[PDB]
Amino acid sequence: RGSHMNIAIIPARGGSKRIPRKNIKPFHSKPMIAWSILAAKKAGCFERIIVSTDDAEIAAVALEYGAEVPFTRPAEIANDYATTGEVISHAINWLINQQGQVPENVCCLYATAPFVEPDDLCQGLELLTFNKECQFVFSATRFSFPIQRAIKLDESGWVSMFHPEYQLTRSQDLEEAYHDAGQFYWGKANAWLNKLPIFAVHTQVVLLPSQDIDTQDDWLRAEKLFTLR
Amino acid sequence: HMNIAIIPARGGSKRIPRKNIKPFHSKPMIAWSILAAKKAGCFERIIVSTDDAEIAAVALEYGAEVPFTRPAEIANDYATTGEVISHAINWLINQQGQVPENVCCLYATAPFVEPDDLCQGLELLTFNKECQFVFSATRFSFPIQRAIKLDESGWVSMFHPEYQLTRSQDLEEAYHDAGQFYWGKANAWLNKLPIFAVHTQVVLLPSHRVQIDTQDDWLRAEKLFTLR
Numbered sequence: 001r002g003s004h005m006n007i008a009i010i011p012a013r014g015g016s017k018r019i020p021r022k023n024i025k026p027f028h029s030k031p032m033i034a035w036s037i038l039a040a041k042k043a044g045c046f047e048r049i050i051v052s053t054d055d056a057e058i059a060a061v062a063l064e065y066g067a068e069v070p071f072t073r074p075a076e077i078a079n080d081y082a083t084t085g086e087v088i089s090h091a092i093n094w095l096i097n098q099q100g101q102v103p104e105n106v107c108c109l110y111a112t113a114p115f116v117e118p119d120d121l122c123q124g125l126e127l128l129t130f131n132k133e134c135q136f137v138f139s140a141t142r143f144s145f146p147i148q149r150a151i152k153l154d155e156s157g158w159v160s161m162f163h164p165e166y167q168l169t170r171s172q173d174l175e176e177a178y179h180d181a182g183q184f185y186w187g188k189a190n191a192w193l194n195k196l197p198i199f200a201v202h203t204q205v206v207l208l209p210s211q212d213i214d215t216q217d218d219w220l221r222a223e224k225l226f227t228l229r
Numbered sequence: 230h231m232n233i234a235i236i237p238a239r240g241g242s243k244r245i246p247r248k249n250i251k252p253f254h255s256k257p258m259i260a261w262s263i264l265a266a267k268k269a270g271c272f273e274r275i276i277v278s279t280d281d282a283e284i285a286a287v288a289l290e291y292g293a294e295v296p297f298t299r300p301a302e303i304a305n306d307y308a309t310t311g312e313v314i315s316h317a318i319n320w321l322i323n324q325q326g327q328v329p330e331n332v333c334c335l336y337a338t339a340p341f342v343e344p345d346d347l348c349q350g351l352e353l354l355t356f357n358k359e360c361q362f363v364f365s366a367t368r369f370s371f372p373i374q375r376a377i378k379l380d381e382s383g384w385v386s387m388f389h390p391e392y393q394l395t396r397s398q399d400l401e402e403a404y405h406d407a408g409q410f411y412w413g414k415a416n417a418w419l420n421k422l423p424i425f426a427v428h429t430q431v432v433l434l435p436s437h438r439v440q441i442d443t444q445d446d447w448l449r450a451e452k453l454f455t456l457r
């Protein structure tokens with residue numbers, strides 16, 4: 001289109017167990033979710049920035065940092081089984097149905113992403129739009145150990161390999177593996193709405209360099225890295 | 230009985246040249262392993278197995294022994310860690326009449342290694358006769374079953390596409406070797422017993438203490454190492 005409509009949706013549900021109130025817990029000098037909102041603003045490639053949440057405290061924080069909160073996320077998709085795509089589809093359909101706004105491209109930006117680089121958000125959009133075959137672009141990172149040589153542990157702590165054939169295989173002889181970094185996901189609006197699979201041959205990645213923020217301890221480590229220069 | 234450390238530190242590399250002695254926070258990588266082994270106090274001897282004279286000199290400078298030059302054929306890009314340890318144990322038996330009981334393979338690129346973990350690994354090994362090895366491991370933070378690969382044009386595919394929409398908590402947990410240490414009964418090493426097998430236990434490390442792909446990883450780790 002001649003007029004761009006690229007939007008950011010930040011999913012954030014309440015109810016975290018391991019880190020209570022995780023999305024509004026202070027990280028450095030701001031509630032954690034604010035770092036994602038601010039990265040989307042700084043990027044400068046979003047027409048709108050929306051938080052999708054069922055939680056009143058999270059919504060209030062979102063408005064404070066200049067995200068929109070146009071709706072309350074339906075209760076049925078704020079649960080332990082709803083997927084990222086379901087949350088993003090809801091938001092896109094809401095914009096279409098309630099405001100007559102049809103976005104072009106839609107970026108899902110997770111709420112725990114203080115190390116996200118704003119330029120990477122716009123890099124992702126440029127990659128998405130550069131290759132017309134492409135339906136999604138997401139942040140990914142390499143595994144630092146060959147997944148083919150992974151182990152499991154039984155309840156008595158005894159080791160076995162997932163693939164014992166690779167006991168003595170060299171790391172450099174195995175196919176390189178990557179994983180979703182859980183930061184951002186660009187998609188064509190229709191890719192989201194048609195529930196197209198993200199990890200598939202119509203998707204590219206932006207590769208990030210070598211953070212877990214899953215535990216209270218992890219939070220403390222990240223605080224230190226955040227201010228390193 | 231006689232518990233020793235063997236640090237296998239060849240001159241060649243799969244990727245980063247001279248990684249075993251590259252400076253990490255202002256000392257050669259191998260120095261942090263030697264210092265940890267000495268601090269741990271549970272080794273009768275600390276031996277570096279190397280083909281490379283530069284590495285030998287670093288090993289001697291930090292107070293490890295270099296009793297032999299490792300033969301070249303077990304310092305190439307294909308020889309396994311176990312073959313290096315077997316060579317060293319057989320050398321000790323045949324050349325010095327020394328018969329170790331437990332042998333710790335301690336890698337040279339493990340600057341976060343903790344002395345207390347080295348001694349704990351020995352205590353675990355020697356509490357059960359069925360246990361042949363104990364090594365340092367850590368959990369994968371992301372489910373390996375949802376891993377992807379990239380083609381030469383950057384397009385994504387899953388290793389296991391059936392797990393596209395599967396929750397992390399519905400997949401079995403996976404771990405990996407942390408590349409720090411491996412305690413083994415001497416005969417386990419000599420008999421070429423597999424390390425990743427049901428006669429082996431681990432010492433689980435929080436992944437924050439298991440480290441380097443890039444020059445930038447290298448710089449970052451150095452700085453975190455200082456804030457650890």
Ligand SMILES: CC(=O)N[C@H]([C@@H]1O[C@](OP(=O)(O)OC[C@H]2O[C@@H](n3ccc(N)nc3=O)[C@H](O)[C@@H]2O)(C(=O)O)C[C@H](O)[C@@H]1NC(C)=O)[C@H](C)O
Pocket residue numbers: 149167168169170171172237238239241242243249303304305307308309310311313336337338406407408411424
């Ligand atoms: C126990 C086990 O499975 N370990 C895995 C290792 O993987 C490899 O790791 P690497 O990074 O190439 O080598 C690890 C360290 O050992 C030294 N080194 C190594 C070999 C040698 N002949 N002489 C040395 O001196 C080398 O210089 C380096 O410091 C890899 O494939 O890259 C290869 C290792 O030989 C080992 N593999 C097996 C089946 O032993 C892995 C960590 O799980």
Ligand SMILES: CC(=O)N[C@H]([C@@H]1O[C@](OP(=O)(O)OC[C@H]2O[C@@H](n3ccc(N)nc3=O)[C@H](O)[C@@H]2O)(C(=O)O)C[C@H](O)[C@@H]1NC(C)=O)[C@H](C)O
Pocket residue numbers: 011012013077078079081082083084085087110111112180181182185198375393394395396397398
């Ligand atoms: C695109 C993709 O595959 N992503 C993977 C995700 O995995 C999971 O990650 P998570 O950490 O549980 O949730 C990610 C973020 O979304 C929030 N959240 C989540 C759900 C919701 N209904 N409402 C929210 O608001 C949650 O609080 C957190 O901030 C996991 O299984 O752990 C679950 C995700 O639903 C998603 N899985 C799929 C197939 O979409 C993975 C990263 O590769």
